[PDB]
């Protein structure tokens, strides 16, 4: 990453306050609602016919927690996101056929969820550091596509 010790600390410190379970379910759910076309990958989850049906779907909530989990662990390898997400990158390419653009949509949704949650705490400088992390993660995840 091209994070400043100061930027690194900021990320790290707010993260410490995150409930991954809740932020994960909310980020994935919002994605499926704001950008409806991302639902193409989750037909097996059930009914995503409404915001309510999406936000309430337990399969969604649990996928969300799985996703933020892996994300969460990547924040511990901020100096080598590439190496941390290599296998996950191959998987998303070769098995899931997920367009990496989805990685970027999620990232933005994630930033909105954090703002939502931390109000005042989620200052311009703090968002700037997070924008750098979500972009970095999306890049690491898309790195092994071929």
């Amino acid at each position: 990453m091209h994070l400043t010790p100061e930027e690194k600390s900021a990320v790290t410190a707010l993260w410490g306050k995150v409930n991954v379970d809740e932020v994960g379910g909310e980020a994935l759910g919002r994605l499926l609602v704001v950008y409806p076309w991302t639902q193409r990958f989750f037909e097996s989850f059930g009914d995503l016919s409404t915001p309510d049906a999406v936000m309430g779907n337990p399969k969604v909530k649990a996928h969300g927690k799985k996703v933020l989990g892996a994300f969460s662990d990547g924040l511990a390898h901020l100096d080598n996101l590439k190496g941390t997400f290599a296998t996950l990158s191959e998987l998303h390419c070769d098995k899931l056929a997920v367009d990496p653009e989805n990685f970027r949509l999620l990232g933005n949704v994630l930033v909105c969820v954090l703002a939502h949650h931390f109000g005042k705490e989620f200052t311009p400088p703090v968002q700037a550091a997070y924008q750098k992390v979500v972009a970095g993660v999306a890049n690491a995840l898309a790195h092994k596509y071929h």
Binding site: G29, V33, V34, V111, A115, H116, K120, P124, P125, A128
Partner: protein, 141 residues
């Protein structure tokens, strides 16, 4: 296209903004300049420092136009004609930048309107900002 639900959602959210639109306008710009520094290339004549009067001033202008847009949600193209003109023929900002401002505007609303920033209102606001972006860049070529 904005559905009736969408138009409702937007008018509500914006309703809550009220007398703070100007400050939210200013906050959205500050977040844009820090997060997407390439956007600064269009304001070389500004003092982009924190709490700059130029930025505040501009923030009000932007906020006002959004207000006007919400008010004429049904006739945006007509309500923003002059602004579409200005951007296409004078400012000539690259279309990609509109997505960056839109994004910073959502984050700002989210951070100030917790209760109101539901997933359904988030979806509508996003669509709205997209529509406004389309209108402001429709006369580019």
């Amino acid at each position: 296209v904005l559905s009736p639900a969408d138009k409702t959602n937007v008018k509500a959210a914006w309703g809550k903004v009220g007398a703070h639109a100007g400050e939210y306008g200013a906050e959205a710009l500050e977040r844009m300049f820090l997060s997407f520094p390439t956007t600064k290339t269009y304001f070389p004549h500004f003092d982009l420092s924190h709490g700059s009067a130029q930025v505040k001033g501009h923030g009000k202008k932007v906020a006002d136009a959004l207000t006007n847009a919400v008010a004429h949600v049904d006739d945006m193209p007509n309500a923003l004609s002059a602004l579409s003109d200005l951007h296409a023929h004078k400012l000539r900002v690259d279309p990609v930048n509109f997505k960056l401002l839109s994004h910073c505007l959502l984050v700002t609303l989210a951070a100030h309107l917790p209760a109101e920033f539901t997933p359904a209102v988030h979806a509508s606001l996003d669509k709205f900002l997209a529509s406004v972006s389309t209108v402001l860049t429709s006369k580019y070529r």
